[PDB]
């Protein structure tokens, strides 16, 4: 007689997914949840990028010849390159990595004079390591030494009050001479000490002669607080200080910039553009990113169990 | 499936059903016809879309670099960082694997449930006018033409209209 | 729900059922009446209570200070702590939202289940004396007074007593 | 159980059923007999095996020593390590408790589902030749011998053969 | 004919919750899982609290005037305050936060005399920076000088063995003078050196003159082990050592103490009292706490789907 | 009347488990997911273990008597022991833990001569603090001093270029004398200065007389790069440098080795051998381990709800 039958759809070949009780069960339709497609470029559309190139991120503060174009910059996406260098004269920043992390999210920097004027000493200390218009020095810094060879450097005090609405990034250097004789030539004989003090900071520095270097040190000065420098030689003085602009991201990559694609997740290999919750491209990312997973593929079922016709 | 309809008492799916997820296949004196059911199909699609709305296109979490890929940081703190990241990777990989497997289990059963619901709905419509054959079909014990088949699909079938004919065909003995 | 009873073939709930979660509404010559079913209601409440016993009143483990509000710690360690703590926040935020979503899905299907169980109990109870209309009601094909309605709810209904009367009515 | 068969309308399990997980028990003129069903039993065991394949024999990621048991490291760093480690313990203790509880919930409902599917299978098989007891039994309204009982078990029972006899017994 | 209908209960106004498939689905009843109610106090009922006030935690070990009232404290809940300072004379502790963390869970400190006696030198070194009744010095520390101006400080050795069953905290100081001629005025002429030695610690110190300061260094000495000090000037000697009492929890807060409420979860803004599994009050907590989540509310359904008439 | 009944199996004595809904529900069968069975040994089957024993890991680089047999070794599993020490003469390594962590995964070390030769000085400097058959010194190092008491040590430059495919671990020491007169005796009077320079490293060292110690310092030298030593005394020169072999795992334990059991998860009290996802043995593990949980037991149901007769 007459009859009515109830049923459901199917396809010839569905997609295999995993469940709590079964591996490789076939469903009508599925979708990927793990992103594996990478864009081998830095996507900078709708952003204000800064490609540092030759210049080191920490170099923007002290100003070696390679960072002349970045002494003041405004950015929301800072790109660091492998060839970047912070220094010209031998030496290093103490707490360098934590300072890089602050500068990466700063939004860029603005410079302001600290207003130090000097008397009875020389200010024009230069080096052929930092060559800018023939034998110069760090652009934001001043190399202080005696008026003539072997003369005694006077016990000096310089104070700076932060007049602004935000924290000031204060930078200073300690010069470690090639020898005891050279330290004597530049600053006069005897032991040297550099003391830096604020309401939250307190440190003393002694030069260690033997191999030519300038080591840089830093602090963040609160609004209306005063930083005090006491020194009798081997002191690299700040001429300017830095103030942060707003908000940014910092990326370490050798990938070319592209102004034709929009991205919010960045890594060394380029840009991840996805609406998916997970990614398998890179464990080290910056920005708004899917969580890193070790799996290549995790298919989510978007349909019923596939049961093809016999 | 938990409900025993899809991949259960219903042998297989229909590949010819392209206009929906669930449907009816009738057979009478006029021939054979196939039609999709809207209510059950959309109810399944909406629940799947609900899952997609929870997982796809969501506001990702914020990330910053604590490592240096150009020049290596100190070993002690660098090993702590690496240890912590790998621990997060293990947690998130577990979360991702479990989430998908749990959702896939619920999805399959969800679709199976809707097939069962539609089956039971038709069963109650027909009352004492039809019997289940065990394969997902209902043997109708009265002449049910194309209009009658349509009234079952759109839920306007009145069992009282055909009850007397049906009971005479179902109860084929003498009642005393 | 997965069982298609609550928000399914049963149109809507009853706002006048305050004595329980599930119940019976009868209609006869003596007028209508409503009574709650203890067994199905208690089964549902116990299961929800079980979820609450799991989540509420947990014994948490002790954590101590690792950074400083008054005197800032060394900058590299501080950035690692902040990176860790916020990553912990995202995991727990994820876990909490998933747990609630998952439990809520189960709780709704759970309550839908108990309604179906009760409906099926009555179906097997009434045997050949009743037909289901499709809305959640059973049409009794015999005279069933308030005491008879009591026997169905009480689970003491004897189908043999009314079988002959109801079979006569179902056929003609 | 969500499906209401196991610990539901079926009063209790059978301790004598060693043959399988689900089975049939019949009463007739020739006595009692118990036999297990292969299809349902295998379906339930396959799914529990599936859960075990997910949890047991996993490949894990390698972790190195970041601490020092013999030469105490800087307490500032050590306390961060101890904080992170204790936080990982908290997360995994949560995950483990939730995973097992969720799986146990699903396993019990899964097995209950299989009982129901078998019960429904037999119901549609018997058509108008039997009536439901309410305790998980089917009252057969025709004389059904051991050969007839076997035909129900292996899905070869023809209801048309017994329909006339059954109907007049039900009146 | 007669009929019996089955159904369920409903309310006019249900609660919206979220599931795996739906957002804002209405249920009969729901219960909050995220704690948002904060108590703006440190709940100290049942506890033995110490409010350090003007005294810094590390100051309790050396004894500047601000910490004279905390030289031997005993608590199970240590509360640090914003205005607390560890020192009077300029200088700092090496590994300061490591020492703070050890002290926060110490249960407080008991002090014990190390028993050092001296001859041929001064022990009465005092400064105007630490006024107690005129010029004085750290209460647990001795400032050692030469007998007179520019006199030679003799090479000296002092040893202390730990007679207790638990580790001893040893503190000592290195004095850095304002100038080179200052160092020669208080002590002898020539290079100064301080060596501190135990069975698992050895370190030498040299003072760097030019800026007036005293820096403090420390070690944990195991039971029956000995600390050896060898010095010839610029040395701030310990008079008493510290032994820990038991268990405690350290809190940094601006909230007032209250002995009328009980709590075990603390933060800068007070106490979280809750049986709920999650909280949105503060991501930085101490003690036994519910886990912090970003969400303001996460409602758990405690009822069926609400289908009104 | 004939009837056919459907049912399930059951046991008289079931196993209680936990669900989302219930605590202590009885099921037919269950299996454990949390490992609690520990093996009180370090399982070394299928591996190449190195039990350092009395030798401290850092000692393998410089060579005190305790580390003579481990000057060169090859391993995939390095076991540190509590009784291990790095030095014979008093002194320490700079950034010691960082170096330990690099050596733990090194796969062992191979040694190579740096080809330093000397003239006009003595190279046989020794001490009774390092005895082998009488007074000896660090096997990999050379204690350089003047030809006789109070003689002038000549200003020397010694350079070495890494000729290998992988980085070289360069070690050197600075000798701090017991007194100024001792420094004069060994090296001659005057300021002593040691500088160490590669393309990525630059540091100068001055001795600090009064201590009696030899402090060791280190750098990683890139392929084809050159390290330059400039010194005029107080300098402990390397004779050999190290190269890493491959991959290894570092373990800290007090448990004896066992070549008859196999495992990949190690801890303080032994080896965890399991296929289970969780373990409640030790929160501090190394290698490929089940994840640590604080529960002693979590039973997974492998059977239906148990309803006995
Ligand atoms: C052979 C020669 O002329 N050497 C001079 C050297 O030049 C270096 C090059 O050989 C090398 O290839 O590149 C490096 C760059 O890293 C040098 O250019 O430079 C010596 C140092 O110099 C200056 C400098 O840094 O450029 C000159 C500068 O005016 C001065 N600034 C001051 C004083 O504010 C600095 C400063 O004194 C030091 O940097 C402080 O540490 O030095 C230069 O001295 C060269 O000289 C040789 O020096 C030795 C003594 O060591 C003898 O005096 C030789 O007679 C003399 O040739
Ligand atoms: C199936 O899912 C895919 C994504 O995986 C999507 O592109 C497509 O729209 C879906 N539907 C069909 C009918 O293929
Ligand atoms: C951490 O791992 C990365 C690779 O993911 C590696 O490049 C780096 O050397 C590791 N850091 C340390 C300090 O071992
Ligand atoms: C980390 O976060 C805390 C609290 O938000 C903040 O006070 C501190 O400045 C942060 N630390 C660093 C190193 O940026
Ligand atoms: C970390 O915990 C271990 C015990 O698991 C303990 O021995 C060690 O002292 C702790 N570290 C610190 C810095 O307190
Ligand atoms: C609903 O739940 C709340 C808890 O949020 C509780 O206070 C109240 O008693 C419950 N109401 C009913 C009617 O059960
Ligand atoms: C059930 O599981 C247990 C424990 O894992 C196992 O020993 C046993 O072989 C299994 N089967 C039965 C019937 O007990």
Author numbering:
A (entry chain A), E (entry chain C), F (entry chain E): 10 to 142, 144 to 158, 158A, 158B, 159 to 220, 229 to 261, 263 to 276, 276A, ...
B (entry chain B): 1 to 176
C (entry chain D): 1 to 172
D (entry chain F): 1 to 171
Paper text:
Glycan array results with NY107 revealed a strong binding signal for the internal α2-6 sialoside, LSTb. To further investigate this interaction, we solved the structure of the NY107/LSTb complex. The final model contained Sia-1, NAG-2, Gal-3, and Gal-5 in the RBS. Although glycan microarray data indicated NY107 to have a specific affinity for LSTb, few interactions were apparent from the crystal structure. Sia-1 still forms multiple hydrogen bonds with residues in the RBS. However, Arg220 and Lys193, the two residues showing close binding with 3′SLN, did not form any hydrogen bonds with LSTb. In the structure, Gal-5 also interacts with a crystal packing symmetry mate and thus the flexibility of whole LSTb may be restricted. In solution, with more freedom, the LSTb should be able to tilt closer to the RBS, and thus Glc-4 may have more interactions with the 190-helix than seen in the crystal structure. However, in the LSTb complex, branched Gal-5 forms extra interactions with the 130-loop, thus improving the binding preference for this particular glycan.
The two membrane glycoproteins on the surface of influenza A virus, hemagglutinin (HA), which functions as the receptor binding and membrane fusion glycoprotein in cell entry, and neuraminidase (NA), which functions as the receptor destroying enzyme in virus release, form the basis for defining subtypes. Hemagglutinin binds to sialic acid (SA) glycans present on host cell surfaces. Here we report a detailed molecular analysis of the RBS of the HA from North American lineage H7N2 virus, NY107, including glycan microarray analyses and structural analyses of the HA in complex with an avian receptor analog (3′-Sialyl-N-acetyllactosamine, 3′SLN) and two human receptor analogs (6′-Sialyl-N-acetyllactosamine, 6′SLN; Sialyllacto-N-tetraose b, LSTb).
